[PDB]
């Protein structure tokens, strides 16, 4: 199912907004909710960094790369949440009128 | 937003299950519910035919190509509906616990 991919971007943004997280930690938090192929978040993270929705920084002592929401990414997340809701509301109006 | 693409497959299957439809008629019924780029359903239809989820037939007098759910496509739709619900249930457990 391909609707699951654009959803990872939204779950990752939402969790990153709560807390600065590193990679494996984010994958294990998404996995509480949806069954994510291990490795599937990293291209999502790389895109959100490239698009400057997230920035990144390292912490040492085994160095670790933390992800941070930017201002741009905070606006984008809030649009994505509003899109998601009224999108799934629309689909549910289809699935129960037919 | 890319979650919207895998959803067209599900809305198209659901409508085709109700009634045999032709192309433009299906696009205008999806548009009651979600804002679909005009033309975006045709690759979705072509895939569902290729994968034998749908079959097709023509009617004349301006010939018109009607779409029909196969048995395979009826099982596939029912899985897709169950996937959709428990998927969006999972996402909503994320979006309101954080």
From TrEMBL, chains A, B:
Entries under InterPro entries matching the protein: Metal_resp_DNA-bind_regulator, Tscrpt_reg_PadR_N, WH-like_DNA-bd_sf, WH_DNA-bd_sf
Top-rank taxon: Bacteria
SUPFAM superfamilies associated with the record: Winged helix' DNA-binding domain (SSF46785)
Domain Transcription regulator PadR N-terminal: 13-78
One family name in Pfam for this protein: PadR
Gene3D superfamilies assigned to the protein according to its UniProt record, in alphabetical order: Winged helix-like DNA-binding domain superfamily/Winged helix DNA-binding domain
Official protein name in the record: PadR family transcriptional regulator
Organism of provenance: Listeria monocytogenes
Lineage: Bacteria, Bacillati, Bacillota, Bacilli, Bacillales
């Amino acid at each position: 199912p391909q609707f699951k991919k654009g959803v990872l971007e939204l779950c990752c943004l939402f969790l990153i907004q709560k807390k600065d997280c590193y990679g494996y930690e984010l994958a294990n938090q998404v996995s509480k909710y949806i069954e994510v192929a291990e490795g599937a978040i990293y291209p999502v993270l790389r895109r959100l960094v490239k698009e400057e929705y997230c920035s990144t920084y390292l912490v040492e002592s085994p160095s670790r790369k933390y992800y941070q929401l930017t201002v741009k990414g905070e606006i984008y997340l809030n649009e994505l949440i509003s899109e998601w809701n009224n999108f799934t509301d629309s689909v549910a109006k289809l699935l129960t009128e037919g």
